[PDB]
Each structure stands twice: as structure tokens, then as C-alpha cells.
DNA sequence: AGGGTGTTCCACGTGAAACAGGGA
DNA sequence: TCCCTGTTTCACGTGGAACACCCT
């Protein structure tokens, strides 16, 4: 049960290759092992639920002569993280961007869907998608965004045009007075066909 | 909270059923106890101690090896349990066994395979009239083929290459 | 686009059965 | 004649490559 959150982020391997990894410890590993990933403990790692790791014929039976047991932990850092960023993250004064900052946060640093996380806040899956798209955006769109000179409709609009485009349809939107239809059709025809 | 927790405590049963540890073959870590210890707080010294739901990990090891290591002298079926056991009593994937044993992936299942056979060619395969070139040709057979085959093999000492056509026909 | 698994079929070295001398 | 031993050859089950299906 450790195991299967312990590799919910970003490794490459499906196994984070760090338990076994110990390979031959060749007087080597206990030298380099200091600053670690904050959070282990020797051959299972019992999370904030504590608990064993199963087999381990191999890993458990090679030991080492010299060991670090200290029971040190990490986790409360990243869980009271985790309560202040969902109670960020349903917030009635927060501009687009901040929002899609901890929407993105959140979809990164754990690993349940943009789903839940909709489920949560209470919006639609392809909501907090478009939220976060919005962050992708130039910094000319961003400043006219945040400055509420453009709304959210269009800003999700111009995603995926290089900067040039963007800033063109953003000056077009402001001072053609645009309306995030008008926005939309704009757009249309300066994607791909 | 405090009231559940001066209750366990007058009531003899503290864990009206025990907790569930670990043992590190050094240390005791915890299974779903947090209320149970939490609230054993209040009650005194150390209150389990003693037999009481528990896995150890010394035990499975020695599994671990007992199964790791065998004299080849067994049979395929007592084999078959094995790999079954190693797969069974521990969550394995077939490769890494294979990997284990010095065998490939293929002959892993196979033998496994030869666990689910008819009670009668199980039997013959225990006893020595029937080969596993033989016994895993009749598996996903239905009971009444596996019969007639087997008494067919039994019967005219057929060699694999033999089962193997006349099994064949009967498959799809 | 991928690993895990079940299922088919035949390559392979082993071991011996057959054959061939050969010493009487 | 018979037994012993040197040689050739190929049947056998074993285990594996390969194929085929799920599960994603």
C-alpha cells in the first residue's frame, strides 16, 4: 500500500528504482546517502500509515553492516500542504491565473485526476482544464487577463498561437471592443486546416 | 475521542479484538490501531505484549527461501505448487520467477497450468504412467476428454509427439 | 503500443538401441 | 560360437520460441 503512493509522481520507471537500487552497496551508498529524499525507512516504507512491505527475498536479506534507522519524517510538510492548497483552491477572490497555479499544483504534485479535482471545487473535468490551459498563455494576454481588459472566454481562445498571433488577436479584442464570440471566430481562422 | 477512550480502557478487552502489527525481525510497526494505541494510552503499560494478530517477517522468509530452494527432486505437481505458491502466497509477476528459477517465462506457466487438470490426470502425473509433455497437452479440456485421452495415452503408450496430434483434434 | 498471461508446437542434447568388429 | 566393446543414429520428454489473448 506505501509503494503504490510512493510512486504516484513523475518517475520514469513504474518502480521508483530506489529500493533496489541499493544493488551492490560496494561501500558506496552509505557515503552518498546523506541529504536523502527526506522521507524512508529500510526495507518497507511504511508511509504515514505505517506497515510491511511484502516479500523482499533479495532486499531484506542483503542488509548492510552500517545503518541509518533514524525514523526521521517528511510527510507533514506535504499533507498540511496538501489541506492549504485544496482550501486555496476553492477560494470566491482568486484571479484566473492563481487559481490555475493551485489546480496545477495540485494535478502535479499528487497524482488524482483533473477529474476529483473538478469534483471538488465543484466545476466540470473540461473546466479545470481550461482554467490551466490558461496559464500557457503570452504575458501580454496574462497582463490584459489579470487587468480584466480580456475575460477568461477569450484568453481560452487564443491558447496554442505563438506569441505574435496572440498579441495581434489581443490588441484586436481590446479597442475592436470584441465580444468572446466575435473572439472565437477571429481565432478560428488563424488555426490550422 | 476521550469517551471511546476511557472505555476501552476499564473494559477488559482493550482490543476487544487485537491489533495487527509488523514485526521488523527488530521492531513492531503498526496496522490499523491508531484508536486502539491512542486510547491505550490512557490505559496502562504495555497491554498488548503477548500473542495477538500479528504478521512476522522471519516466518516469511524462511517461506521464502524453503521456496526459493528446492533439491530438484520433486515432481511437477509439488513444483507447480511452488512456482503457484511463490505467485500465490506472495503477489509475483511470472517473469521475475522465471528470472528466479533459471527457466523461461513460458515453462512457468505451463507448469502451473498443470494445476488445473482433471482429478484422474493429476493422479496419473503424481503416480508415473503420465509425462507433463503429456498432462499439460490436455489442459482447458473438458472432464470426459481428458478421460478418453488419457486412457488413450495410458492405454497405447503413446510418446508426446503421438498425445500431442491426438489431443489436437479435439480442440476447436 | 504494452506488458502480462495462456496455449501451441518443435528444436534440442541425452541416452540408449542397434550395429559392427574382435578377441576368444 | 558369445561376450565384450567401439561406433553411429534417432526417439524421447524437456523446456522454449512463438503465437495469441486479454488486461490496459
Redesign the interface.
Known amino acids: 500500500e506505501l509503494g503504490i503512493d510512493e510512486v504516484m509522481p513523475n518517475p520514469y520507471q513504474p518502480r521508483k528504482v530506489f529500493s533496489e537500487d541499493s544493488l551492490e552497496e560496494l561501500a558506496q551508498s552509505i557515503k552518498e546517502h546523506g541529504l536523502l529524499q527526506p522521507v524512508l525507512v ?2 518497507e516504507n ?1 508511509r504515514y ?4 512491505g ?4 533479495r532486499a ?2 542483503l542488509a548492510k553492516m552500517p545503518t541509518i534507522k533514524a525514523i526521521v519524517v517528511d510527510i507533514e510538510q506535504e499533507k498540511m500542504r496538501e489541506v492549504a492548497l485544496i482550501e486555496n483552491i476553492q477560494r470566491e477572490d482568486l484571479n484566473p491565473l492563481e487559481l490555475a497555479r493551485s489546480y496545477k499544483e495540485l494535478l502535479e504534485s499528487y497524482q488524482m485526476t483533473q477529474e476529483e479535482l473538478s469534483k471538488i471545487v465543484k466545476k466540470s473535468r473540461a473546466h479545470v482544464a481550461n482554467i490551466m490551459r490558461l496559464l500557457t498563455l503570452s504575458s501580454k494576454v496574462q497582463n490584459a487577463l489579470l487587468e480584466e481588459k480580456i475575460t477568461s472566454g477569450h484568453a481560452k481562445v487564443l491558447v496554442g498561437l505563438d506569441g505574435e498571433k496572440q498579441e495581434l488577436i489581443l490588441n484586436s479584442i481590446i479597442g475592436q471592443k470584441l465580444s468572446v464570440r466575435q473572439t472565437e471566430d477571429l481565432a478560428r481562422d488563424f488555426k490550422i486546416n
Request: hydrophobic share 40%; proline share 0%; glycine share 8%.
Open positions: 529500510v526495507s511504511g500509515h505505517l506497515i510491511a511484502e516479500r523482499r527475498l531484506s536479506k
